């Protein structure tokens, strides 16, 4: 049975009663010197009674594979490698340096934006000094800081042309009757749009505008549009380069907000749609690459006064495209109320409904919402009030579950008034009224 | 330690032996049937003879009890004292008792097993010494006065400590307390050991398995939002899932499917372990109900798989095994089911595997692609594998028929896959 | 240089360095001989106090030590010092310039091995005196016979045999006639640990991939194999209180307890020792004891006890996880700033580059304890930043 034979131990003899510990393995009181293999067997039995012989050695000699892989590995989650998506209800935030900390602000932060490709943040508040920071995870500084007197700005944003991408125009507007454009060129040249061509009796303010591309659809002069709000039901679409009134659209009932959804048509063609709400909450969905006339209209399931609508998932204002072929049909729409109830709608079946039911109607933050923005890829929704402290929630979607681990009570959010995302970095930025803008990042991106 | 607890240990050690008349009657008065002042006047022969009558009627309704007649319910058993004999024959005694207890785990709805087990309680003292197997054998009947009785007379083990405010209370212990009993792996390793003995005796049945599975999915539900606890709790539930599939009963096999589906939707597992689970639940699949449930659980297992490589090829030895257990027309009628469960990722991997490891019968893939709708990255990877297949083997009418179907819906997909690989002029050359 | 005012005394606050320790029994006691750089130290294992130190340093650093009953065999650059009660009792100069690597003690024959697969074995002049003092012979393993050495030991019930564990092969010896007896089979990867088993004549040996082979040397086979994904294994042990438990220690700071009667992981332990300082350098069960003594390279020694089971009927299937028991540590990086606490020269404070603060006690070296970073809560309403 042995694979080897020593051929030396069998010719040995040991007097076992020389000492105390080797004299118990005798068998008679007359035997003194014993043979070698007998000696091996005797002390082998002594070993087997000094530690017993368990069953796992004489078990064997090396529908099963579940047990085999389960006994192999420890970490039973694949998410170490790729993960390609978010994990629900527990996200991987970390904190970064406070983005206002280099050169602080004094008023609230009513607008906050990112450059679409360059690593640039824009901050704008009621103290009429629009600052621009270069932001990074360690120490983030102020590139420039334009100040403009007599115009406390409310909302301001970046813009690049889709065609030749070398324009980089800021647009800014406050409660006054003029807005400003800026071609940024690392002493500034800014223009003051105030020429209202068609309608001059519907703007007590310019304090709500968006910017959006469109195609010509007989030629392909892809160019900008400023979309300003009015007072009765009016939202006016201008030009961004020139300043011409392109046209306007009035909905019935008071405008509360609006958003822009593009959709591709062919390889090189696309179509823009404007979505607008009341306080009542019946929306108009009309394209405006042809003349602005309503092609769909339906009604939100609920809301007495709804406050803020934001589309996302594909491309939008906050996540813009660079090449014209890089533009994408959206997926998610979201409508938010003064009661706090945010409905979020899918838009892959709800172009057919004419009264669509919500995918989810969530309510976690109690008071009225002010800002809500999607991720650039459409997995996080970000909701925030302007009423109480720590009034922001993050929602994983398509599962439509609020993240539990963040934000806790101990997060230093402050009374939030604005929020924005990165175009790519997964770098999130929140601003409050007491001045500071803080910076987090999402480690999955 | 101190003297008081230092001899409370020896009091608990020798609680089984009666030392005088008062402790003798306080020990003898424990009974599953009669109350205290009735039970304190019974003798051993009385309960033995009515228990032997209960046993023989229980043995004609179940033919596997005459062995316990021969060795545990014999006439010498009323003289056999427990705590007077050595550790090896007390080991024989209580493993025989455990055999009886798992065997009579089913019969507790009917009173012959109550009168059969009450002499076993009164003589061999299982209500103090052999308490664990008793509790987790009769734990299924927790809304029953037999369990309220047996918990009123039991001395409570250190594991089942959540029940100690349910002794001598008329309320039966509730389902939430049963979950909080099941909610630590010190209890769970015990209960998986017990289920392993039930499997290798085939004493499994439809009520114990139902209760066990329901508490396991409730444990996973409580440990939903605890990632460390859930990852701690994997290798016991999956362990008895694999030990549960090794048996023959359709009920324990679909119970294994139940814990597998709820665990897969509880947390995202890895591709290798979910493929081993898929081939394991396939490798012992016999009855039709097991076929149906296993197909549902395979589809949901693959639906809860994220990350890249999710819709990749299942390999050859799992693919041919899936085709051996499940023919193609069963897949076709399951996809023809009107409820339409979401099975898109499994059907995507099935299409890529039938196109790569069989490459012969493409009527199947065309038919089921007509029968379901499917998303864009899935159909992109399918038509990429079809491009590679159409260039390795010569084109057929079926291949070009499904190709022109993918022309007829969503042209620019196969156009962009040709832009990745060649040109539509070259594809029309290979037409 | 030599001085004339200050004489050096002791390097306090130092527990381990990363050399695998050894253990020894005396009656029903247990002592742990650990290495600290150049001198070693002898703790006990019951209360884990210090007991002994070497009375004077070594020339080089100690590379390998072992322990029989009273005696401690230290091994550095060229020699092996047989020590008693922390006092050197006999040098043994080896017959080479090659640096010694490993050693083992059994019966009469001491056996040390250098760094070129050359094994000096020594023998006691009288089969009654206390330590091997006399050179017996010099075996030499050649590269035909196996790889370069990684351990050696005499596993039990073998009549004057020995087991050299190389990087590719296991090979026995009969040390009386100087003969090789049984080369083993071929092994396809580098093995790095081999510890014997308390069952008859088998040895568990773990590789650089995470598998443990269990070689049966009498049979010349392997019995089982424990596979573990991509773990650089470092230190095996077995538990000998009857209930069979294997324990592997992975240099990623892991300690995995395997059952062997049913091939199951009993409990894993993650990040027990720090990764970057070597991980689990040496971990062992005290024999006949349900405790574990681990030591890392990060200046830390720990004891983990196995509790009794809670299932009084089931027993060996339900195993309680290991608790944490006594441990002795210092900070694992060189200390930045140093103060003296009291006028009596009893306590002193260290703060190290690994950002920990310790209060060492230079009077009695079990009083040294880490200061704790648990903030007093702001009782004016604020939140801790």
């Amino acid at each position: 049975e042995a694979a080897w034979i020593d051929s030396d131990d069998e010719k040995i003899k040991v007097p076992i009663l020389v000492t105390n510990k080797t004299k118990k393995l005798r068998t008679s009181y007359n035997e003194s010197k014993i043979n070698g293999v007998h000696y091996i067997n005797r002390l082998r039995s002594q070993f087997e009674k000094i530690y017993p012989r368990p069953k796992w050695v004489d078990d064997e000699s090396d529908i099963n594979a579940l047990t085999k892989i389960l006994s192999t590995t420890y970490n039973y989650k694949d998410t170490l490698s790729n993960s390609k998506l978010l994990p629900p209800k527990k996200l991987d935030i970390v904190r970064l340096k406070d983005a206002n900390a280099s050169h602080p602000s004094h008023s609230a932060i009513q607008s906050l934006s990112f450059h679409p490709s360059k690593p640039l943040l824009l901050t704008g508040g009621y103290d009429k000094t629009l600052r621009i920071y270069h932001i990074d995870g360690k120490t983030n500084h102020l590139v420039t800081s334009l100040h403009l007197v007599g115009s406390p700005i409310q909302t301001c944003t970046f813009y690049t042309s889709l065609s030749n991408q070398n324009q980089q125009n800021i647009f800014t507007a406050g409660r006054r009757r003029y807005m400003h454009s800026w071609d940024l060129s690392l002493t500034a040249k800014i223009e003051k749009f105030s020429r209202l061509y068609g309608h001059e009796s519907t703007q007590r303010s310019f304090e709500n505008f968006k910017v959006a591309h469109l195609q010509n659809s007989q030629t392909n002069s892809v160019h900008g549009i400023v979309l300003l709000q009015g007072n009765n039901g009016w939202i006016n679409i201008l030009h961004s380069t020139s300043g011409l009134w392109l046209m306007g659209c009035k909905i019935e009932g008071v405008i509360t907000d609006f958003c822009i959804d593009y959709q591709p048509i062919s390889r090189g063609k696309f179509r823009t749609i404007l979505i607008a709400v009341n306080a009542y909450g019946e929306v108009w969905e009309f394209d405006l690459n042809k003349n602005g006339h309503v092609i769909r209209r339906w009604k939100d399931q609920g809301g007495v006064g709804i406050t803020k609508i934001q589309v996302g998932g594909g491309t939008t204002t906050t996540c813009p495209a660079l090449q014209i072929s890089k533009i994408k049909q959206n997926r998610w729409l979201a409508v938010g109320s003064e009661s706090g109830f945010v409905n979020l709608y899918d838009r892959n079946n709800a172009m057919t409904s004419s009264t669509p039911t919500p995918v989810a109607a969530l309510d976690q933050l109690t008071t009225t919402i002010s800002n809500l923005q999607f991720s650039p890829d459409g997995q996080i929704l970000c909701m925030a009030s302007r009423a109480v402290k720590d009034a922001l929630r993050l929602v994983h979607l398509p599962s439509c579950s609020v993240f539990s681990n963040w934000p806790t009570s101990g997060t230093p959010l402050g009374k939030v008034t604005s929020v924005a995302f990165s175009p790519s970095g997964g770098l999130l930025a929140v601003g409050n009224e007491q001045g500071k803008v803080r910076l987090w990042k999402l480690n999955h991106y | 330690s101190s003297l008081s607890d230092q001899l409370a240990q020896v009091a608990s050690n020798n609680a089984t032996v009666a030392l005088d008349r008062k402790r003798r009657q306080k020990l003898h008065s424990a009974s599953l049937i009669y109350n205290s002042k009735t039970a304190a006047t019974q003798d051993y022969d009385f309960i033995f003879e009515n228990a032997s009558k209960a046993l023989e009627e229980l043995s004609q309704i179940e033919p596997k009890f005459a062995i316990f007649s021969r060795t545990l319910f014999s006439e010498s058993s009323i003289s056999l004292d427990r705590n007077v004999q050595t550790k090896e024959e007390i080991k024989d005694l209580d493993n025989a008792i455990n055999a009886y207890l798992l065997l009579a785990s089913s019969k507790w709805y009917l009173a012959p097993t109550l009168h059969a087990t009450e002499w076993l309680v009164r003589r061999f003292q299982i209500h103090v010494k052999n308490t664990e197997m008793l509790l987790l054998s009769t734990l299924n009947y927790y809304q029953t006065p037999v369990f309220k009785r047996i918990l009123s007379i039991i001395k409570l083990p250190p594991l089942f400590n959540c029940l100690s405010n349910f002794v001598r209370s008329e309320k039966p212990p509730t389902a939430l307390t049963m979950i909080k009993l099941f909610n630590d792996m010190d209890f769970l390793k015990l209960y998986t050991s017990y289920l392993d003995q039930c499997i290798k005796h085939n004493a499994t049945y439809t009520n114990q398995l139902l209760f066990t599975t329901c508490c396991f999915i409730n444990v996973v539900a409580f440990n939903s939002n605890n990632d460390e606890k859930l990852n701690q709790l994997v290798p016991i539930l999956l362990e008895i899932s694999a030990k549960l599939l090794a048996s023959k009963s359709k009920d324990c096999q679909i119970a294994a499917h139940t814990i597998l589906v709820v665990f897969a939707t509880a947390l995202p597992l890895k591709k290798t372990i979910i493929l081993a689970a898929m081939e394991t639940i396939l490798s012992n699949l016999d009855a039709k109900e097991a076929k149906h449930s296993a197909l549902l659980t395979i589809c949901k297992l693959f639906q809860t798989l994220k990350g890249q490589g999710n819709v990749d090829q299942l390999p050859s030895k799992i693919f041919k095994l899936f085709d051996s257990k499940f023919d193609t027309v069963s897949i076709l009628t399951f996809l023809d089911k009107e409820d339409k469960p979401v099975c898109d990722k499994f059907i995507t991997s099935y299409t890529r595997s039938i196109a790569r490891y069989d490459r012969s019968k493409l009527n199947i893939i065309l038919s089921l692609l007509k029968k379901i709708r499917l998303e864009r990255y899935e159909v992109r990877l399918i038509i990429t594998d079809l491009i590679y297949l159409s260039e390795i083997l010569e084109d057929k009418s079926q291949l070009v028929e499904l190709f022109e179907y993918f022309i007829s819906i969503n042209e620019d997909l196969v156009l962009k896959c040709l832009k990745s690989l060649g040109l539509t002029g070259e594809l029309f050359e290979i037409r | 240089k030599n001085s004339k005012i200050f004489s050096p005394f002791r390097i306090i606050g130092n527990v381990s360095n990363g050399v695998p320790f050894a253990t020894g029994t005396l009656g029903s006691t247990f002592y742990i001989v650990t290495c600290v750089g150049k001198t070693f130290q002898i703790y006990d294992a019951n209360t884990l106090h210090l007991l002994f130190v070497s009375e004077k340093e070594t020339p080089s650093s100690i590379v390998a030590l072992s322990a029989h009953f009273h005696y401690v065999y230290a091994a550095y650059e060229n020699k092996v010092g047989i020590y008693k009660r922390g006092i050197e009792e006999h040098l043994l100069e080896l017959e080479t310039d090659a640096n010694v690597e490993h050693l083992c003690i059994f019966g009469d024959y001491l056996c040390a091995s250098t760094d070129d697969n050359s094994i000096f074995i020594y023998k006691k002049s009288d089969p009654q005196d206390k330590y091997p003092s006399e050179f017996y012979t010099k075996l030499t393993v050649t590269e035909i016979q196996g790889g370069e050495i990684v351990s050696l030991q005499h596993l039990a019930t073998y009549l004057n045999k020995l087991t050299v564990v190389t990087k590719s092969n296991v090979l026995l010896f009969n040390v009386r006639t100087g003969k090789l007896v049984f080369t083993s089979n071929e092994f396809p990867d580098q093995i790095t640990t081999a510890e014997p088993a308390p069952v008859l004549d088998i040895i568990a040996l773990g590789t650089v991939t995470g598998e443990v082979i269990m070689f049966n040397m009498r049979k010349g086979k392997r019995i089982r194999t424990i596979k573990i994904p991509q773990s650089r294994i470092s230190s095996l042990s077995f538990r000998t209180d009857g209930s069979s438990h294997l324990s592997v220690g992975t240099s990623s700071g892991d300690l995995i307890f395997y059952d062997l009667d049913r091939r199951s992981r009993i409990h894993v332990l993650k990040n027990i020792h720090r990764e970057s300082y070597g991980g689990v350098t040496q971990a062992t069960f005290l024999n006949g004891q349900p405790i574990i003594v681990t030591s890392g390279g990060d200046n830390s020694l720990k004891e983990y006890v196995f509790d009794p089971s809670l299932s009084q009927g089931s027993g060996d299937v339900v195993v309680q996880p290991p608790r944490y028991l006594r441990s002795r540590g210092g900070h694992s990086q060189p200390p930045s700033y140093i103060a003296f606490a009291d006028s009596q020269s009893h306590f002193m404070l260290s703060a190290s580059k690994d950002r920990s603060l310790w209060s060492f006690s230079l009077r009695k070296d079990a009083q040294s304890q880490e200061m704790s970073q648990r903030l007093h809560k702001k009782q004016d309403g604020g939140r801790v930043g």
Binding site: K33 | N161, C162, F187 | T25, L325
Partner: peptide, 28 residues
């Protein structure tokens, strides 16, 4: 009431160990 996960005073019981002294021999 939860399960009393409870430690105790631990004690080092008696060792019982094979020693290697009886593993050598000599030619007589």
């Amino acid at each position: 009431p939860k399960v009393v996960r409870e430690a105790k005073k631990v004690e080092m019981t008696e060792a019982r160990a094979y020693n290697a002294d009886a593993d050598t021999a000599k030619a007589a």
